[PDB]
Enzyme design. Structure first.
Site, mmCIF file in Angstrom:
data_model
loop_
_atom_site.group_PDB
_atom_site.id
_atom_site.type_symbol
_atom_site.label_atom_id
_atom_site.label_comp_id
_atom_site.label_asym_id
_atom_site.label_seq_id
_atom_site.Cartn_x
_atom_site.Cartn_y
_atom_site.Cartn_z
ATOM 1 N N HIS B 40 -35.049 -20.547 -58.028
ATOM 2 C CA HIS B 40 -35.184 -19.505 -57.013
ATOM 3 C C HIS B 40 -36.563 -18.847 -57.023
ATOM 4 O O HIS B 40 -36.869 -18.081 -56.102
ATOM 5 C CB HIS B 40 -34.034 -18.486 -57.104
ATOM 6 C CG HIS B 40 -34.166 -17.505 -58.227
ATOM 7 N ND1 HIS B 40 -33.518 -17.643 -59.432
ATOM 8 C CD2 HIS B 40 -34.878 -16.353 -58.310
ATOM 9 C CE1 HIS B 40 -33.830 -16.620 -60.212
ATOM 10 N NE2 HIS B 40 -34.654 -15.828 -59.560
ATOM 11 N N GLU B 52 -51.157 -14.148 -71.499
ATOM 12 C CA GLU B 52 -51.211 -12.791 -70.965
ATOM 13 C C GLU B 52 -50.519 -11.791 -71.871
ATOM 14 O O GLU B 52 -49.486 -12.087 -72.483
ATOM 15 C CB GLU B 52 -50.511 -12.710 -69.609
ATOM 16 C CG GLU B 52 -51.274 -13.295 -68.468
ATOM 17 C CD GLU B 52 -52.395 -12.370 -67.964
ATOM 18 O OE1 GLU B 52 -52.833 -11.427 -68.672
ATOM 19 O OE2 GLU B 52 -52.857 -12.628 -66.819
ATOM 20 N N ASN B 54 -51.431 -7.656 -71.038
ATOM 21 C CA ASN B 54 -51.570 -6.769 -69.883
ATOM 22 C C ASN B 54 -51.897 -7.629 -68.667
ATOM 23 O O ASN B 54 -52.981 -8.213 -68.577
ATOM 24 C CB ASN B 54 -52.650 -5.730 -70.156
ATOM 25 C CG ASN B 54 -52.732 -4.680 -69.078
ATOM 26 O OD1 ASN B 54 -52.489 -4.970 -67.896
ATOM 27 N ND2 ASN B 54 -53.083 -3.457 -69.465
ATOM 28 N N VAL B 57 -55.151 -6.439 -66.453
ATOM 29 C CA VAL B 57 -56.472 -6.343 -67.057
ATOM 30 C C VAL B 57 -56.821 -7.687 -67.669
ATOM 31 O O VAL B 57 -55.991 -8.295 -68.352
ATOM 32 C CB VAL B 57 -56.496 -5.250 -68.144
ATOM 33 C CG1 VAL B 57 -57.833 -5.225 -68.881
ATOM 34 C CG2 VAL B 57 -56.203 -3.878 -67.544
ATOM 35 N N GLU B 62 -56.569 -15.138 -71.692
ATOM 36 C CA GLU B 62 -55.923 -15.651 -70.494
ATOM 37 C C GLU B 62 -56.445 -17.032 -70.117
ATOM 38 O O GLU B 62 -57.642 -17.318 -70.219
ATOM 39 C CB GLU B 62 -56.216 -14.737 -69.303
ATOM 40 C CG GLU B 62 -55.606 -13.354 -69.409
ATOM 41 C CD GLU B 62 -56.574 -12.306 -69.933
ATOM 42 O OE1 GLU B 62 -57.685 -12.635 -70.430
ATOM 43 O OE2 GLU B 62 -56.241 -11.110 -69.829
ATOM 44 N N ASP B 84 -30.186 -23.769 -61.440
ATOM 45 C CA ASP B 84 -31.317 -22.873 -61.166
ATOM 46 C C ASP B 84 -32.423 -23.143 -62.187
ATOM 47 O O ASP B 84 -32.652 -22.390 -63.145
ATOM 48 C CB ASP B 84 -30.846 -21.421 -61.185
ATOM 49 C CG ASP B 84 -31.886 -20.454 -60.651
ATOM 50 O OD1 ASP B 84 -32.884 -20.912 -60.074
ATOM 51 O OD2 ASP B 84 -31.729 -19.216 -60.835
ATOM 52 N N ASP B 171 -30.994 -5.233 -70.777
ATOM 53 C CA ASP B 171 -30.834 -6.420 -69.934
ATOM 54 C C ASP B 171 -32.196 -6.879 -69.412
ATOM 55 O O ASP B 171 -33.179 -6.141 -69.469
ATOM 56 C CB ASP B 171 -29.923 -6.045 -68.748
ATOM 57 C CG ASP B 171 -29.237 -7.223 -68.054
ATOM 58 O OD1 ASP B 171 -29.450 -8.412 -68.346
ATOM 59 O OD2 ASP B 171 -28.431 -6.883 -67.158
ATOM 60 N N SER B 172 -32.240 -8.106 -68.896
ATOM 61 C CA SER B 172 -33.342 -8.562 -68.047
ATOM 62 C C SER B 172 -33.160 -7.984 -66.642
ATOM 63 O O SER B 172 -32.063 -7.576 -66.258
ATOM 64 C CB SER B 172 -33.386 -10.081 -68.019
ATOM 65 O OG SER B 172 -32.146 -10.578 -67.580
ATOM 66 N N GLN B 174 -35.419 -7.349 -62.440
ATOM 67 C CA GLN B 174 -36.244 -7.985 -61.412
ATOM 68 C C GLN B 174 -37.692 -8.120 -61.873
ATOM 69 O O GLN B 174 -38.325 -7.138 -62.269
ATOM 70 C CB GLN B 174 -36.162 -7.180 -60.110
ATOM 71 C CG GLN B 174 -34.954 -7.542 -59.219
ATOM 72 C CD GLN B 174 -33.594 -7.137 -59.809
ATOM 73 O OE1 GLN B 174 -33.451 -6.036 -60.344
ATOM 74 N NE2 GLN B 174 -32.585 -8.017 -59.681
ATOM 75 N N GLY B 175 -38.228 -9.334 -61.753
ATOM 76 C CA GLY B 175 -39.502 -9.731 -62.320
ATOM 77 C C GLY B 175 -39.393 -10.563 -63.579
ATOM 78 O O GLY B 175 -40.380 -11.202 -63.982
ATOM 79 N N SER B 177 -37.022 -13.077 -63.875
ATOM 80 C CA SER B 177 -36.509 -14.391 -63.504
ATOM 81 C C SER B 177 -37.459 -15.495 -63.918
ATOM 82 O O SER B 177 -38.679 -15.383 -63.764
ATOM 83 C CB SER B 177 -36.344 -14.496 -61.986
ATOM 84 O OG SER B 177 -35.064 -14.012 -61.566
ATOM 85 N N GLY B 178 -36.887 -16.604 -64.352
ATOM 86 C CA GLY B 178 -37.642 -17.764 -64.746
ATOM 87 C C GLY B 178 -38.125 -17.747 -66.168
ATOM 88 O O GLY B 178 -38.514 -18.798 -66.689
#
Ligand SMILES: [Ca+2]
Lengths: 14, 223
Positions: B40, B52, B54, B57, B62, B84, B171-172, B174-175, B177-178
């Site tokens: 999804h 990563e 931060n 910044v 990175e 999924d 919990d996990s 939004q953001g 996912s994956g």
């Protein structure tokens, strides 16, 4: 009521 | 991640951020050229950001690498969220070091009660929104199949499992996912869905990676 945890979320009627 | 803690820079070296001018999903590095995420999370124009802490910044360590292939499971059901899972091939191989490292795929499924590490840059509030700059972490157990199905009647397939808490607050979200659910050094889950975040009696639901190890290997070998 289910929703995915993405930005933005995808939600479903349940 | 709601109810978690600041991981510390590069302490989760397999965690990636999927970026499209903003962080939208997580993922897990499984070799120098391939990332596992959720189906999804698929879109065009994905830039994978490795190393990563931060995300707002440029701090050092990175690596930004475009996705060259994004392979959604052919049997992904966008209504039930069965299957999924997505594989992302990087345009160039990542440079692996202590701060950018792959995570092993499982050899067996994990038992209920096994403690796992769930991580990401998702919302840290169960009501409202606050998006963190730095990576957050949560220790969470795998729940039993019977408790998972009791919480989500008719919605849990053989390719899903629940992890987390029934009392609320952790919990996990939004953001996330994956991103990864790692248990005893193996990638056992992908953050997928839930009824809200961190709500009582509604734990997070995760894609069961052990069921896909053969599919992952076969797909990587042919691409
Ligand atoms: Ca950064």
């Amino acid at each position: 009521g289910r929703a995915t945890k993405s930005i933005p979320p995808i939600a479903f009627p349940d | 991640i709601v109810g978690g803690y600041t991981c510390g820079a590069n302490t989760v070296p397999y965690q990636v951020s999927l970026n499209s001018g903003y962080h939208f999903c997580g993922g897990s590095l499984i070799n120098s050229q391939w990332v596992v995420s959720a189906a999804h999370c698929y879109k065009s124009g994905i830039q994978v950001r490795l190393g990563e802490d931060n995300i707002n910044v440029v701090e050092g360590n990175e690596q930004f690498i475009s996705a060259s292939k994004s392979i959604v499971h052919p049997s992904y059901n966008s209504n039930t969220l069965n299957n999924d899972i997505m594989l992302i091939k990087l345009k160039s191989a990542a440079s692996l070091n202590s701060r950018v490292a792959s995570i092993s795929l499982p050899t067996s499924c994990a038992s209920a009660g096994t403690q796992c590490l769930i991580s990401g840059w998702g919302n840290t509030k169960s009501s409202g929104t606050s998006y963190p700059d730095v990576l957050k972490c949560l220790k969470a157990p795998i729940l039993s199949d019977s408790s998972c199905k009791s919480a989500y009647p008719g919605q849990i397939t053989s390719n899903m499992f629940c992890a987390g808490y029934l009392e609320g607050g952790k919990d996990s979200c939004q953001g996330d996912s994956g991103g990864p659910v790692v248990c005893s050094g193996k990638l056992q889950g992908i953050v997928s869905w839930g009824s809200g975040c961190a709500q009582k009696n509604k734990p997070g639901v995760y894609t069961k990676v052990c069921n896909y190890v053969s599919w992952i290997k076969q797909t990587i070998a042919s691409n």
